[PDB]
Design a binder for this molecule. Structure first.
Ligand SMILES: *[C@@](O)(CO)[C@H](C[C@@H]1CCNC1=O)NC(=O)[C@H](CC(C)C)NC(=O)c1cc2c(OC)cccc2[nH]1
Ligand SMILES: *[C@@](O)(CO)[C@H](C[C@@H]1CCNC1=O)NC(=O)[C@H](CC(C)C)NC(=O)c1cc2c(OC)cccc2[nH]1
Lengths: 297, 297
């Protein structure tokens, strides 16, 4: 059982480089539109406090250099949607997949294709944290890298990368340009809200361990849903809802372990610690596998 | 630090399915050759003690069903190289990347594109253990999935996918030679006892130093032989000359001589971590290569 990303080929064919003046970043080329973070129009001075509509009206189509591989695409129009710039080009991307733009919910996972200078570099799985950060791996020039899920050849784009917080976690927007979380595309040191642990995912991951032959953390006890949630909130875990209980059904039926039985196991792990033992190779409780992630794998 | 896979698109375009009788697995289509595990030719009555040479004589080109999706590729020749079958087909794959076949050493990392019926399912990083197993995530039908590294758009294929009774996985290089002492028969096989990948732990310590976490740097050095003798008493792999040289770039970057870092690790092995952490963790990580570290740092 490993963190597994979706195959990235359908997205790789869409990554381009966008350059405005001295600033370059990545763009997403779908049909005849290139989507990229709007701060590509800011100079190192503008970015401390950018008035984006005022800066964008002063730019011309020819101010934007878009490169796909080596070939330059001609920008024939541009509009802004929240924090995302939409550059219209005279060439349709012939490798555009079936796609949708979606805004994901906290606790849901997606694959990130990290890119630099329009070139894909790496792929890995992230979860949208409850405080709307993600724990990714992004360096200078990664802005405009995207996150996505794939379901039967349809790519659902959910994330476009914008910033790294002082704590080293990351923040970005959906493909409509609205940030996840309270962040703003200005060059400032921003803190997130206090993060919490994705309870339903920890439970799904304990089920994954049982499906894979590890049972050491199980116990004879049970708990009520409310009593579990009282302990969970005390340990900065998210509440577990009845919808979460229902979503864990298949894993429960597959293993024959009642959800609230597994909740009692997690309660014990939380109150007694792991005592130096490991689960699926981890010395920490893992919360970035969803129940679907476990089933799909 | 994230386990990051290479973008998989260049390999996705090479995946096909190969069927013999009722047995379907995955194959790798490069130029006009499809490479796949030779046990596709076995029936349930052959796999226990297969005589591959006599089984292959009874096969003809028209016994092999090779499909890119649902499109059949006509087989025009067949041969066996060690544990791989090579089916010559009448169409050169237009998506063939620049590629090489490489045999990796223990400790090296690579991306696995897990595939089923020729259709890529997910991608993730693996490390070759010193006992020549990988901790993969493979189900029924995964055989023929490949592992690879990508350097300047050249794909170096290193792995073609058995699951041991312990749940780890074994396979061959693309010339059909198993990593480790395994054979392609339907038989419960055991790997040698594993060891910790020393060169990768040292890479991890360099990564910590790069990031300002350097409490473990001491005032000692060691000879390579003295370190290797200690390492073996703690179930750590001995270092080779090649290991010393691939640590060269990180040693230059930090100014910490390789043998000085060996002396720091030796102290950690003999005394333990004393409840202290390195890069946030009480456990030393051995699945990041020196290349992986320079890439994320
Ligand atoms: C982009 O790629 C910009 O094109 C860049 C991506 C990060 C660089 C290092 N790792 C990354 O993920 N994003 C930024 O540089 C953004 C730009 C904003 C959205 C206009 N800024 C930050 O991520 C940022 C600014 C500051 C800061 O200021 C002062 C202080 C502390 C942290 C910090 N992060
Ligand atoms: C390929 O899909 C087969 O074409 C399959 C992959 C494994 C299935 C479960 N996870 C995998 O990685 N491979 C096999 O089933 C191979 C086939 C051989 C090479 C002919 N066999 C095994 O992996 C195998 C057989 C036995 C066994 O016997 C008896 C006893 C214990 C373990 C075991 N593994």
């Amino acid at each position: 059982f490993r963190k597994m990303a979706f195959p990235s080929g359908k997205v790789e064919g869409c990554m381009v480089q966008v350059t405005c003046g001295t600033t370059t970043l990545n763009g997403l080329w779908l049909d005849d539109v290139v989507y990229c973070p709007r701060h590509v129009i800011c100079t190192s001075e503008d970015i401390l406090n950018p008035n984006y509509e005022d800066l964008l009206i002063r730019k011309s189509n020819h101010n934007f250099l878009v490169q796909a591989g080596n070939v330059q695409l001609r920008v024939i129009g541009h509009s802004m949607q929240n924090c995302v710039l939409k550059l219209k080009v005279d060439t349709a991307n012939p490798k555009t997949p079936k796609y949708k733009f979606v805004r994901i919910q906290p606790g849901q996972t997606f694959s990130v294709l990290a890119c630099y200078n329009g070139s894909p570099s790496g792929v890995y799985q992230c979860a949208m944290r409850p405080n709307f950060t993600i724990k990714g791996s992004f360096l200078n020039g990664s802005c405009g890298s995207v996150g996505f899920n794939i379901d039967y050849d349809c790519v659902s784009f959910c994330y476009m990368h914008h910033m790294e917080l002082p704590t080293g976690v990351h923040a970005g927007t959906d493909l409509e340009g609205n940030f996840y979380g309270p962040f703003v595309d200005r060059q400032t040191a921003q803190a997130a809200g206090t993060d919490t642990t994705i309870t339903v995912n920890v439970l799904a991951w304990l089920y994954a361990a049982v499906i894979n032959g590890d049972r050491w953390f199980l116990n004879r006890f049970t708990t009520t849903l409310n009593d579990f949630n009282l302990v969970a909130m005390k340990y900065n875990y998210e509440p577990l809802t009845q919808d979460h209980v229902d979503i864990l059904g298949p894993l429960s039926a597959q293993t024959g372990i009642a959800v609230l039985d597994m909740c009692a196991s997690l309660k014990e792990l939380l109150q007694n610690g792991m005592n130096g033992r490991t689960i699926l190779g981890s010395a920490l409780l893992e919360d970035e596998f969803t129940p679907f992630d476990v089933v799909r794998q």
